[PDB]
């Protein structure tokens, strides 16, 4: 099922899940099916496993399937994983921020307008209510990336 999800062959994985196979299959690195599915940007395979409730679990490298999807600029599987009926704000905003980050520096998927728009969407959804607000836990500045200190306000963004 893992190599079916990594490849684009949705028929093989849908037949495998039609046989009542294990969706919570742990791997050596912790990647459980959806991590391979939402790495090649296969939206239909991810839908097939969410239909069978493959569940979201953090792998060995500290990455959810949603964060794995957002790491590789694959926006559609990010959309599908953001509607899991248990996603929470903190994960949703960190996924949107990760997607905007990934769109900034990549060979295949390089859009700077998508970078700004997804960062602004995550910032607006951060500072949307004014109550139980989710302020950014900004890391200390790093000399490699100039001397910037992220963007803790929508005005500086």
């Amino acid at each position: 099922l893992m190599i079916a999800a990594y490849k684009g062959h949705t028929d093989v994985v849908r037949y495998l899940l039609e046989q009542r196979a294990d969706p919570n299959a742990k791997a050596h690195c912790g990647a459980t099916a959806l991590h391979f599915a939402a790495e090649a940007g296969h939206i239909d395979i991810v839908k097939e496993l969410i239909k069978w409730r493959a569940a979201i679990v953090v792998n060995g490298h500290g990455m959810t399937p949603l964060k794995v999807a957002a790491e590789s600029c694959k926006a559609d599987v990010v959309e599908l994983l953001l509607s899991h009926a248990d996603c929470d704000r903190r994960s949703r905003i960190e996924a949107l921020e990760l997607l905007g980050a990934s769109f900034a520096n990549d060979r295949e998927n390089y859009d700077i307008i998508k970078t700004y728009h997804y960062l602004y969407l995550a910032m607006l959804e951060r500072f949307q209510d004014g109550d139980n607000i989710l302020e950014k836990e900004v890391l200390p500045p790093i000399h490699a990336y100039g001397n910037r200190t992220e963007c803790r306000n929508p005005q500086e963004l």
């Binding site: 190599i3 990594y6 791997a27 050596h28 690195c29 060979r107």
Partner: peptide, 15 residues
């Protein structure tokens, strides 16, 4: 010669 174009789990992606 275009450093950007020069850029570019192997045992796990085996069948």
């Amino acid at each position: 010669k275009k450093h950007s174009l020069d850029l570019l789990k192997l045992r796990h992606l085996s069948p």
